[model samples]
Target: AKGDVITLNFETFVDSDTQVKVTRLTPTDIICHRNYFYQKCFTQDGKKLLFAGDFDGNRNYYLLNLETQQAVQLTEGKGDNTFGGFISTDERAFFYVKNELNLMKVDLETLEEQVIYTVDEEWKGYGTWVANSDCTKLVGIEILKRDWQPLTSWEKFAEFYHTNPTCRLIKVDIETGELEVIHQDTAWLGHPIYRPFDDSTVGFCHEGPHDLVDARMWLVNEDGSNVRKIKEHAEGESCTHEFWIPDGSAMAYVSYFKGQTDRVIYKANPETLENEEVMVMPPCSHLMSNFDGSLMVGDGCDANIENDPFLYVLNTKAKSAQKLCKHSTSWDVLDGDRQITHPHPSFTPNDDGVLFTSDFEGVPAIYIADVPESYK
Candidate 1:
C-alpha cells in the first residue's frame, strides 16, 4: 500500500455547461460499502486521516491508516456521532461536533471518543483553531440556528443568516469542559481564529446587527475579557473572514464591497491594529492562509486574465513563494449543474497537501496528494 497511487471512485452527473462527466469522488475509498464522509483531518505524522462516513446511512467516524490500508471505525451505534471534525496539532486525538450532543473528542490510538461539552440549545460547534500541545484555551464559534439548512444551502446564502443570530465567540477549557461565552449579544459573530503567535488572543468577524451590511473585524483576549474593535465595514460591505498570520503577529482576511462585486485581501498587525491591502483580484477569487505566514507568498506580476487558479508553496521561512502546480478550466469539469453532492478535501494543521474524494474511476473513492513536498 505504500506505493499505491491514490485513486478516485466514479459516479455520473449533469452540469451547468450542459455536459455530464462521471465523478467517482466519495467520502472514503472505494471500500466494500459506505454511505458518506466529511470533516477529514490528517495526522501530523501523515500516516492516517480521520473523517466521518455513513454506515447504513448513520453518520459514524472512522480513522483510516494510509500505510496499512485499514480504515478503523471510531464510533459505533450512531445517533451521537456526526462529522466536521479536526485533528489535534500533535495527532494524539480529534475534536468534532456531535449530531444532537455537544462537542466530542476521540483518541486516535485508543479509539476512545469523549464528549467535551454540551448545551441545552442547538449550537454550531467549534470551527478550527490553532493552539498549543495541551489545548488549554481555544477560541471557537457557537451558532444557535433554527434550522440546519444555512450550513448547507447555496441560495442567497448568509442573506437569510439567522435573524436572531445567537452565534458568538467562546473560550473553552478543553480539559475541564468549562466555557465562557465571548460575545453573544452582538448582532452576528463567528469565525473565531486564534493568533498563531499567542493562542490567548483571537480575531473574528462581528456583525453588529442584521440590517448592517458591514461586519466588523475584531480581536479579543481568549478569555472573553478584553476586546478590541479593529476595523468596521461600510454599509452594505461584508467583512468575510480573517486569520492570524503564521507568526501570530498579523491578521489577514477578505472583504467584499461595492455590492459584493469588489473583493480584496487585507493584512493587519494584530498588535498595533494597523492594516494594509495585500492582494486584489479583478473579478472573483478566494484567498486563504498558508497556516504558517512566515512562508513567503510569491507575488503575481505574471497573473493574467487567462491565467488559471494556481497552487502556491511558501517555504517555512516565509522568505520565498513559488507556483507548485497550476490548474485551469481544462482540468475542472463538472456534471449535472455541478450539484456537488459530496465535497471533501484532505486537510491538516500544517498546510500539507490535500486529502479529498474523487470519482474519476467507477465508484466513489478517496485520494491524497503528498505532492508539492515543500510544505511537508
Candidate 2:
C-alpha cells in the first residue's frame, strides 16, 4: 500500500539568520492544508504527517510517511474530514468530523473507521473538537442548524457571528456515546480546547473579530461553573489564536497591538493568572509551541509588512526569530473557511523541523522545513 507514495527531496534555502532545507510533500496542484496548529499533524513516532487535501474535489484526510516521503489518501469521496488529530495516548488511530456533523475515528493500520457519535440534524458541530488527555472525552462548540442562505458578504457574516446567541459548548463521551452541554449562550463561541493534564479545566474563545468580541479568552470548569475571562482585549488592541501548552501547565496566545501591526506572544498560568510576555515579533498568526514550550513557530500573515508570506521559528528563551522559508501565498482566496489553506506552521515533535501549508505553487500543499543544529 505504501509503494504508491511519491518521494520528494528537500531544497535548501538561505534565510537571513540561517540556512534551512524545505521539502514539498504534495506536488499535485490541489488545495491541501496542514492540520491546525493545535491539532496533532504528526503521529507519536513523528514519522507520518496528517493533513486535509482536496484530492477528489472534496477536502479529506491524507497521511504522509516521512521515511518514505510518500502520501497515501486515507479517506474518500466529497464530504470534508477536517480537524483530524491523533487519538488518545497512542497514535494508532485518529479522529475527525465527517461533514461537520458526525465524529468518527479511523485506525491507522487497518484504515477501518467507526462513527463515534452523530449530532442531531438540528445542531451542527462548529469547527473542530479537542480530546482530553485520555482521549475518552471530546469537547467542542455547536450551532443551531437552520435552512439559511449562504453568507455572501463578510459584513453579514460578522454580524451573524457577533449577534447570534445560538452556540453551545458540548462534551462527548466516546465510551457511552453521550453528549453533555458544558455551557450555552446566545453569543457565538468556539475554539474550545481541553487542558492536556487537567480535563476539568477547558478554555475557549469568543467568536468574533478580535476587537469586537467582549473577551478574547475564557476559562470554565467542566461542570459549567466558575466561568470567567482569562484574557481581555485592550482598547485598540486585539488578541487571538489561544493554545493550551502541551503539558497543560499554562496557556498562550498572540496579542496584536499598534493597529495589528505588532504582535506579542503571552503565556499565562491558568491557575494563578500570571501573564508573561514570551516574545515580540513581526506580525504573525496561528502560533504553536514545541513540546517543552522552549520554541515557537508562526506564519507571517501580514502581507502589508512582509515581502512574501514566510514561516518563522522563534526561540522563546533567546528571544530571537528566524525566517524558515518564503511561502509565496495566493492571498486572493484567503478568508474564513478558506483560511485552512493558510500556513499554520507548527513544530515537529522532536523539534527538529516544522510543518506547514502553502499555496506558492498555485495550489495549497504541505511543506516541511528542517531545523539546523546551529539554530536549535
Candidate 3:
C-alpha cells in the first residue's frame, strides 16, 4: 500500500457563526490532519496540500491535489510520527523519522525513500526532523534515552523536564549521511528548526512548561558557537508558539506577561536580538504569518476572551483581526496520554485560505477556511 492512490471524500459548507467558506478534506472514519503550522504543508503553486492520514491504522503522509480532490499515499508501513514531518524546500519530497531510529527522506514523485541518517540504540531521535533552506542538510534533537513516563498531564510532562536529561542537537549532511553533533547539554531540548534563507543557523527550545523553563527560544550556529536566547523573559512571563517568518525577516513569537490578560505578539531580529512589539491580542495558542508577514492567523484560546472558539486572521499592518471560523477544538494535551489535538491554523501557500485541524464534528479532521474578500 505504499503507492496506493485513494480518491478521498470531501464536503464543503458555510460556517454558521463566521459565515466563511469551510471545506472538509478528509472523512470521519480515519485520523487525518495537516502537518504542523510551522512547516510548509502546501506546494508553492498552492495546489498540492500535504497531510497525514491513518487510513490503514498506520500514520503516513499524503498529498491532496486541490484540483482533483485525490490524495496519493506517499508513505507506508509503521514508524511514522503523528506530527507528520517537514516538506522539502523543493516540494518534491519530505523527511520523517521511522522506528525512532532511521531518518527517512521520502520522494514525492517516485515514492522512493532514503535513510538520511540513522540513530543508534543507545540514543534516540527526539522530535520532528527539519531541513535547511537548500535541503542539503538536516537537524534534529536526540536524547540519551526515553526512560520517562508517558507525557499525559502537565505535571507528568514537567516531571521529565525535571530530570534534566542529556540532549544533543545533531545535523546530517543530506547527500553524504555525515552526522555532526552541533550542540549538547544535560537538559531537555526540543523543536529543532532551521532558519529560512540561511543554512548555518538553527533555532531550538528548552522543553518544559513555558513559565518554568530558564529560557524558551534559543539560536546557535551549526558549528556550535554563539549560543544565545532570543529574549530574556520578564519575571512571571511565559512564551509559547514561536516561529520564523517565511521570508526570514524576523522571528515571531507570542508572549504573556505577569498579571496580564492579553497576549502580545513580537518580532525579534534574529541577528541582533532586538524586538519590536507587533500587537496585543486575545490569548492565541498558535500564530502564523504569510510569506510576506503581512497577514497572520491566530487560534483563539482561553474562553475568558469574548471571541472564544474561533480562529482569526490578523493584519500585521493594521493590527486588526477578522473572524475566520469556529474551530471548537477540545485542547487536550494528550488523548489517553499520547495524542495531542490543537487548532494549529496556518495560511495556505497563496494566503487565500487556512488549513487547520478541528474536532468540532466529534472527530479530528482537516479543514480549510477561505479568507473572505472583504477583509483583504
Best by TM-score: 3
**Winner of 2 and 3 under TM-score:** 3
* lDDT, each prediction: 0.51, 0.75, 0.83
Per-residue lDDT of 282-309 in model 1, one digit per residue for the tens?
A: 3223233454544422212223256433
Which lDDT tens digits does candidate 2 get at residues 127-196? 6889998888999888877622245797877877755657889999988989999998877888899988
User: Could you arrange the candidates by lDDT from highest to lowest?
Assistant: 3, 2, 1
- For model 2, which pairs clash? 165-186
Worst 10 residues of 3 by lDDT: 332-341
lDDT of the structure predicted as candidate 3: 0.83
Candidate 2 global Cα RMSD? 3.0
- Residue-by-residue lDDT tens digits, candidate 3, 225-314: 989999987787777778899888888888888778788888989888888789877557788988878989988877533647889899
Q: Give the poorly placed runs of model 3, Cα more than 4 Å off.
A: 146-152, 304-307, 332-340
For all candidates, the clash counts are 22, 1, 0
List the lowest-lDDT window of 10 residues for candidate 2: 1-10
